[PDB]
């Protein structure tokens, strides 16, 4: 078990981010990697035992501290949009045998005026599908969000469901031309038709959005695009 | 100095089929070879390792990698892949003097397509939970072999195929979603449709 | 019949400081090479006429190996200090002896990988070259970790590879 925090972080250029990693093993090696599509895994800094710090392949813009045997920190003092990535912490006590953390997703924005929480809607099953296949497919749709930093989940009767669910593995841009285009994302939940036709059953598509912090300065006339959960729902209908 | 190469960035294979992911690396008199797997939304896990001896490292999950001193490779094979094996596969190598500092491949995203027993293709129309007029088109229950293409309109939106598994009754189905704010069901999906689908 | 040996020793210094590391090599029980950290400019130097005929880059390379081994010894000293529940004021010694016995023809005949802590034997690779022997319960921890990571395979890479070949090359100069 290797743990890291925060799992999600959004900041602006010139911001100050500190990724913490803590291992339960008593391994001597600890590493900070970043994973980018096209480059794969790239070592930033590493450490052999407490107090030790060694330069990785791409250390520029980053600093690191190994305070204790268990803790390793990665410091981004002058945030850059280039530093937008997925950061992994690892530990090792054997050559090339590594234990990774679950990841930390960092988003660095050049300007804040193009940040949008998503609009979420649930689309209810078709009577055609229900008659034909004896199943019912609900579709959640989250549109117009920036940046690409959301988590979609389904909730039936207060429990989070993982069976019969399919979310897009990657969102699509609402206007692929623009560099700072918003994003859209879709998911489907399929249940038995007899389940959907019970008005006592409650279906929630919940979208966790990561945006501006509360302490963050904001100077626009409109609702602030903070970190929030935007949710949509649908009730069972017998008809 | 050391360099690792994985030739195919994305690989799609049928369920129950035979798989090979390739790993070639720069020469080393002292090769330490590894395969790591990364399932969606997690970190990497070590799958296989080789320091010396019998060059056929045999995993317990059916995977096995083989080290070739001549080819200078470490290829990953599975005789019959499971649907769960859909992940990103990285191979990594290190050498003497940097034994604990790995060099990673670019990885290979593996998609395991499910074998749909009873393809009953269809394009349904689903209405909003609140605003009855706003709707969405859903192409579903098509087989793995067919292929959804993006919009020609550029103001219509289409998502790639997506497999969902109703594990409670062992059922798997493909799915693609289309929406636009001159829109129906048949007008969308202007690419490679199977004729025998309910409208 | 022939044999090659390396004795690498590290002694921790009390309080603030970095351990004294020494490494010595023996071909047929004759010292042919030596490293010491205390030296004004710590490098690997030959202790025998023939080894002088090796190019500078050889010495630079193995000196680099020594420079890594230092770190290894420092850290693992800390580890063993922890296993035994000992005060961090104590001066302690950790030694690694490793080598190969090569038969008349040139095949590998025996392999050696063993570690001692403060004079007493800690953990030693067995004759089958895949099993370890552990003296006490801390060595039982090290043994477990090494059974899990497969350190025997890693060392066998050297014992079956570089050890035999380099022994033959070192005999080529006699």
């Amino acid at each position: 078990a290797v743990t890291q925090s925060p799992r999600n972080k959004v900041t602006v250029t010139g911001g100050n981010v500190t990724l913490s990693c803590r291992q339960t093993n008593s391994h001597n090696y600890m590493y900070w990697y970043r994973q980018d599509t096209g480059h794969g895994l790239r070592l930033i800094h590493y450490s052999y035992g407490a107090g030790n710090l060694q330069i990785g392949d791409v250390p520029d813009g980053y600093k690191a501290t190994r305070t204790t045997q268990e803790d390793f920190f990665l410091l981004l003092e002058l945030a850059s949009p280039s530093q937008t990535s997925l950061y992994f912490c690892a530990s090792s006590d054997a050559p090339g045998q590594l234990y990774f953390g679950e990841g930390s997703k960092l988003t660095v924005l050049e300007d804040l005026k193009n940040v949008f929480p998503p609009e979420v809607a649930v689309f209810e099953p078709s009577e055609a599908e229900i008659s034909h296949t004896q199943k019912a497919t609900l579709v959640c749709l989250a549109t117009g969000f920036y940046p690409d930093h959301v988590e979609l989940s389904w909730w039936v009767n207060g429990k989070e469901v993982h069976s019969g669910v399919c979310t897009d593995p990657q969102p699509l841009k609402e206007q692929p031309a623009l560099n700072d285009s918003r994003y859209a994302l879709s998911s489907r939940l399929r249940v038995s038709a007899t389940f959907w036709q019970n008005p006592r059953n409650h279906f929630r598509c919940q979208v966790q959005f990561y945006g501006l912090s509360e302490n963050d300065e904001w100077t626009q006339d409109r609702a602030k695009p903070v970190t929030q959960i935007v949710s949509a729902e649908a009730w069972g209908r017998a008809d | 100095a050391q360099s690792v190469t994985q030739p195919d960035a994305r690989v799609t294979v049928s369920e129950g089929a035979s798989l090979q992911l390739r790993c070639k690396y720069s020469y080393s008199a002292t090769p330490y070879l590894f395969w790591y797997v990364q399932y969606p939304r997690q970190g990497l896990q070590m799958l296989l390792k080789y320091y010396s001896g019998d060059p056929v490292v045999q995993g317990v999950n059916g995977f096995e990698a083989e080290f070739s001193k001549s080819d200078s490779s470490f290829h990953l094979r599975k005789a019959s892949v499971h649907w769960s094996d859909s992940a990103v596969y990285f191979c990594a190598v290190s050498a003497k003097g940097t034994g604990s500092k790995l060099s990673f491949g670019k990885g290979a995203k593996l998609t395991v397509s499910p074998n749909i027993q009873n393809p009953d293709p269809a394009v349904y129309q689903l209405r909003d939970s609140k605003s009855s007029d706003k709707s969405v088109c859903l192409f579903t229950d098509f087989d793995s072999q067919t292929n959804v293409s993006q919009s020609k309109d550029s103001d219509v939106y289409i998502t790639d195929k997506c497999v969902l598994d109703m594990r409670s009754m062992d059922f798997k189905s493909n799915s693609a979603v289309a929406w636009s704010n001159d829109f129906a069901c048949a007008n969308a999906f202007n690419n490679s449709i199977i004729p025998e689908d309910t409208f | 019949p022939h044999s090659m040996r390396y004795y690498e020793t590290a002694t921790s210094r009390r309080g603030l400081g970095e351990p004294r590391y020494t490494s010595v090599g023996y071909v047929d029980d004759k010292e042919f090479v030596r490293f010491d950290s205390d030296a004004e400019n710590p490098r690997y130097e030959p202790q025998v006429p023939w080894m002088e005929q090796e190019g500078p880059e050889y010495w630079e390379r193995i000196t680099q190996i020594a420079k890594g081994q230092e770190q290894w010894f420092r850290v693992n000293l800390r580890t063993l200090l922890g296993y035994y529940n000992q005060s961090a004021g104590g001066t302690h010694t950790l030694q690694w002896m490793y080598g190969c016995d090569v038969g008349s023809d040139g095949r590998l005949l025996r392999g050696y990988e063993q570690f001692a802590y403060d004079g007493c034997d800690y953990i030693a690779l067995n004759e089958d070259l895949r099993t370890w022997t552990a003296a006490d319960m801390a060595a039982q921890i090290t043994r477990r970790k090494w059974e899990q990571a497969g350190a025997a395979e890693y060392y066998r890479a050297y014992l079956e590879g570089e050890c035999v070949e380099w022994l033959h090359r070192y005999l080529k100069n006699g």
Binding site: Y29, A94 | - | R61, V75, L80, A151, E162, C163
Partner: peptide, 9 residues
């Protein structure tokens, strides 16, 4: 040539 221990005890 000497080897490298690498493995943490």
């Amino acid at each position: 040539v000497p080897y490298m221990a690498e493995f943490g005890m």
